[PDB]
Ligand binder design. Sequence first.
Ligand SMILES: NC(=O)c1ccc[n+]([C@@H]2O[C@H](COP(=O)([O-])OP(=O)(O)OC[C@H]3O[C@@H](n4cnc5c(N)ncnc54)[C@H](OP(=O)(O)O)[C@@H]3O)[C@@H](O)[C@H]2O)c1
Ligand SMILES: Nc1nc(=O)c2nc(CNc3ccc(C(=O)N[C@@H](CCC(=O)O)C(=O)O)cc3)cnc2[nH]1
Ligand SMILES: [Mn+2]
Ligand SMILES: [Mn+2]
Length: 159
Amino acid sequence: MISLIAALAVDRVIGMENAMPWNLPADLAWFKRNTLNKPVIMGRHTWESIGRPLPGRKNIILSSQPGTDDRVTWVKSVDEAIAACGDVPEIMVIGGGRVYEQFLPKAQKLYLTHIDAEVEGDTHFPDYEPDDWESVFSEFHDADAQNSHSYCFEILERR
Ligand SMILES: NC(=O)c1ccc[n+]([C@@H]2O[C@H](COP(=O)([O-])OP(=O)(O)OC[C@H]3O[C@@H](n4cnc5c(N)ncnc54)[C@H](OP(=O)(O)O)[C@@H]3O)[C@@H](O)[C@H]2O)c1
Ligand SMILES: Nc1nc(=O)c2nc(CNc3ccc(C(=O)N[C@@H](CCC(=O)O)C(=O)O)cc3)cnc2[nH]1
Ligand SMILES: [Mn+2]
Ligand SMILES: [Mn+2]
């Protein structure tokens, strides 16, 4: 399948000129657990923001331009990105906004972290058609020493 994973603040904000507005290590740890040993597809701006390869995962970068780093795989279209992933039980699409929009209709599963934080962003998760998704997992966490906002991990499956 194809699955999207994202962390959403209020109103589906996911970023602000190429930095995430927070630092919730419980959520990054959820991200790592759900992506480790799977291929991850990302757009070029998200590659830039991370700033390095994600270890333990096949990193596939979409760009309409030649690639500039041979430590990751560069592809020029959605069909090529999926093909580069070969024979894998689960393909993880890790954003950003433009990439999420294109992979949504080919997604079976959404791993969403809803963060209770108010932030004034420039990129959104495409979100919304609720009727087409069943929530099968939801786990809510209050803020603590390490994590300054409350947040909820949710897994949705396409009905
Ligand atoms: N909250 C979260 O979980 C999360 C997750 C990921 C990212 N983010 C944030 O999202 C923001 C980045 O998102 P974004 O929407 O600006 O950019 P993006 O989706 O990461 O990257 C867009 C770029 O990817 C390339 N691309 C996308 N689809 C393509 C296709 N079918 N074929 C060829 N190339 C394609 C293009 O590169 P070229 O311009 O090189 O052609 C395009 O400019 C940042 O703020 C980031 O921190 C947040
Ligand atoms: N749930 C979720 N949360 C996010 O913060 C997130 N971020 C991105 C894009 N940004 C990033 C930034 C860093 C790393 C990274 O290298 N993560 C480490 C865990 C430690 C950490 O991120 O601080 C990893 O090895 O996965 C991945 C994606 C994509 N999907 C997400 N999904
Ligand atoms: Mn808050
Ligand atoms: Mn979900």
